Design a protein around this ligand. Structure first.
Ligand SMILES: C[C@@H]1O[C@@H](O)[C@@H](O)[C@H](O)[C@@H]1O
Lengths: 40, 40, 40
């Protein structure tokens, strides 16, 4: 299936972004490595 | 030059994450792999 | 800690997504590599 993403967050401690999914009981997420930094 | 992401979707079987780009003919996408899992 | 992504863009020539983050002076972002392409 194609599973819709509801919203995103990212964490500078873990260097993970997390997508909340519209699926099942509402507590599934998708997660991936990201860089995080203060820009200019 | 960066363009808006219109939406995110996530495949149920591969956990491939697809971002639909607002640009030109509307058929451009971005893609990456993710880990999907169930939380508390 | 997880902070909201307020905006999401993708850059075709760099193959990078940039997430803008709701934190601090508002210049925090997150970035990851992506495949970019035109769909059928
Ligand atoms: C965007 C920020 O990134 C790092 O500085 C973290 O220590 C914060 O919790 C926040 O996630």
């Amino acid at each position: 299936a194609p599973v819709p993403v509801t919203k995103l967050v990212c964490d500078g401690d873990t260097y993970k972004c997390t997508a909340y999914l519209d699926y099942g009981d509402g507590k599934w997420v998708a997660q991936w490595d990201t860089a995080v930094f203060h820009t200019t």
